[PDB]
Design a protein around this ligand. Structure first.
Ligand SMILES: C[Se][C@@H]1O[C@@H](C)[C@@H](O)[C@@H](O)[C@@H]1O
Ligand SMILES: C[Se][C@@H]1O[C@@H](C)[C@@H](O)[C@@H](O)[C@@H]1O
Ligand SMILES: C[Se][C@@H]1O[C@@H](C)[C@@H](O)[C@@H](O)[C@@H]1O
Ligand SMILES: C[Se][C@@H]1O[C@@H](C)[C@@H](O)[C@@H](O)[C@@H]1O
Ligand SMILES: C[Se][C@@H]1O[C@@H](C)[C@@H](O)[C@@H](O)[C@@H]1O
Ligand SMILES: C[Se][C@@H]1O[C@@H](C)[C@@H](O)[C@@H](O)[C@@H]1O
Ligand SMILES: C[Se][C@@H]1O[C@@H](C)[C@@H](O)[C@@H](O)[C@@H]1O
Ligand SMILES: C[Se][C@@H]1O[C@@H](C)[C@@H](O)[C@@H](O)[C@@H]1O
Ligand SMILES: C[Se][C@@H]1O[C@@H](C)[C@@H](O)[C@@H](O)[C@@H]1O
Ligand SMILES: C[Se][C@@H]1O[C@@H](C)[C@@H](O)[C@@H](O)[C@@H]1O
Lengths: 310, 310
């Protein structure tokens, strides 16, 4: 390993945001502080001078953004209250109002977060697991945090994946949420602007490891078309990918890359499509590694050890 | 899962002590508290009313005992100081003097602990990883905790296995310590009463997962003979066993049982030989399971879900 890599918590939560190939990655260090590494034509930071929040050890991490003008990063306090680190262009980093609402979740809860697409207004939906193991939606729509729709019972400590886009034909955001149920299946809940939340759980994988990491993204949204990618750590100790492609539905499942036992994962994407995965695969023991996909070279490992590791 | 199982921290540290088939198992709950489950012709306890200490989330755990008269359980504070929960017959549980010595270790350090065998006096040796990644020995011999021998550089966050016995022919304890080096090998350091600490690192396994759990025991010590068992989580997501048997040396390596990704492990034994392993394999998601070995039936899974899970 390296002195920098040692600062990164083993099996740390991971989250990432971007505006095309301008990237931010968030993770937890060994003392509980949440750090930010960035990519601006080169990787940097991720040091003790790059802390945006403090959370309990082994906290989940979630993040969403509107380009890089507005960024929100979610974690858990030591009392298992959802808290929010907020960045706004022109104001910098500050404590968000979420913790003020005093939403307590399960100790083993994960978090998902999305800005609602299709509008310039700042609307947020975040998802967590309450003490009754149900996946609760919490919302921001301009004046205060409120509980939203409850998405039903999930496995204790389930991973939570979430993505959001807007069909050109429709006037409102579409939302997809992925988690693991008691039968260890991976399933999808769905919201569309013209239907509201569908009742149907859609299975995307029959049997995954318990509390496996889950993360999802979407690209190339159209009039009534979408392409989605969902990633989870399978029992063979690699990240697996599930593909939704317009005109084919869920039509592919394949391994992507090795990871350490019990690695967390983050996924970002931009039009192209370009994909970036972040995870731990044992590089310098505890460093975060990058996996890439692009039209030019296809599936390629990226940055081997993110800052502060190198 | 079950409400009881949910209280058990995922990938919790695990430690166990015994006097023959009278057993104690220690683990961490989701709020950081260290609990004790027991076996006295039946499993019990492990509830919030059975807390013996409080430690940082994801703390290592180590424990050693002289039968069940004296028990010591070691963990890390949130400042990564070694602390000790102590039980003495007739006095019950109390804070041990270890934390008073203010030994700070690496955030990712593990702990090993042994009472020195062969004497009725209460002598302790405990092993941890300092911030320079060297494995430091700390000792108790009657009046105060002191740093002992340093065993050299190990992998950052290495597991630490340790066992202790007394050869009948010799007048002093023998000690064996196992950890993982930078080349991801598993190795042995050795102390004998007539030689002191040998200089030689002995390899017992060529390549294990980074920071894999490690735990060891011994049985049937003789005049100049010993039998040892070392357990670690391999890359196939099972516990593997390494056997030392008198007249054969290190002569066997085999899988034992499946475990969750990144499970910790504990091992106890008594004359027979009887062996008990404790670990997490996904039973009720987060419960601790038992694996057994005896002369009667050989390799058999034991208690599927320890208290408080059931
Ligand atoms: C053409 Se460099 C490629 O794309 C960048 C946006 C980053 O993901 C970098 O780590 C990767 O190696
Ligand atoms: C314009 Se400052 C730069 O860009 C923002 C998107 C944030 O990630 C901030 O922490 C970083 O220092
Ligand atoms: C302008 Se309030 C600021 O932005 C909102 C979108 C929310 O994230 C809120 O919690 C935060 O405090
Ligand atoms: C206008 Se309904 C409101 O916004 C939607 C996008 C969903 O988050 C729904 O659950 C919530 O109740
Ligand atoms: C047409 Se390749 C297909 O779509 C890409 C965008 C990637 O998700 C790749 O892993 C998948 O196999
Ligand atoms: C003859 Se029961 C057998 O031995 C006991 C000492 C315990 O380890 C128990 O869980 C196991 O099932
Ligand atoms: C004689 Se009390 C019983 O036995 C001791 C060995 C301890 O494990 C204690 O916590 C338990 O309640
Ligand atoms: C009679 Se002091 C008691 O017992 C010793 C063996 C040590 O574990 C010490 O730290 C503890 O406070
Ligand atoms: C009488 Se030397 C003392 O006790 C031995 C058993 C070892 O722990 C050694 O490292 C220590 O320095
Ligand atoms: C003579 Se079986 C041999 O020794 C036993 C005590 C156990 O460790 C078993 O796993 C091993 O295969």
């Amino acid at each position: 390993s390296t002195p920098g890599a040692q600062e990164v918590l083993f099996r740390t939560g991971i989250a990432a945001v971007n505006s095309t190939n301008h990237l931010r990655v968030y993770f937890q260090d060994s003392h509980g502080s949440i750090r930010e590494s960035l990519y601006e034509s080169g990787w940097a930071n991720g040091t003790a001078k790059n802390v945006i929040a403090k959370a309990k050890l082994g906290t989940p991490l979630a993040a969403t953004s509107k380009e890089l003008k507005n960024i929100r990063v979610y974690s858990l306090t030591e009392d298992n209250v959802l808290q929010e680190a907020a960045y706004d262009s022109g104001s910098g980093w500050y404590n968000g109002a979420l913790a003020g609402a005093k939403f307590t979740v399960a100790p083993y809860s994960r978090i998902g977060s999305v800005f609602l697409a299709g509008t310039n207004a700042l609307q947020l939906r975040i998802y967590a697991q309450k003490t009754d193991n149900t996946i609760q939606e919490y919302m921001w729509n301009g004046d205060g945090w409120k509980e939203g729709t409850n998405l039903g019972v999930a496995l204790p400590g389930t991973g939570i994946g979430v993505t959001c886009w807007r069909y050109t034909d429709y006037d409102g955001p579409s939302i997809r949420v992925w988690f693991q149920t008691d039968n260890l299946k991976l399933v999808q809940r769905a919201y569309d602007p013209h239907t509201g939340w569908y009742k149907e759980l859609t299975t995307i994988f029959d049997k995954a490891p318990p509390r496996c990491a889950i993360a999802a993204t979407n690209f190339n949204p159209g009039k009534s078309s979408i392409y989605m990618r969902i990633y989870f750590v399978n029992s063979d100790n690699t990240i697996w990918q599930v593909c939704w492609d317009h005109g084919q539905g869920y039509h592919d499942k394949r391994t992507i890359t090795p990871v350490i036992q019990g690695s967390e994962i983050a996924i970002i994407s931009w039009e192209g499509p370009e994909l970036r995965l972040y995870f731990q695969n044992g590089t310098y023991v505890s460093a975060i590694s990058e996996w890439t996909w692009g039209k030019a070279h296809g599936s390629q490992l990226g940055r081997r050890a993110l800052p502060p590791a190198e």
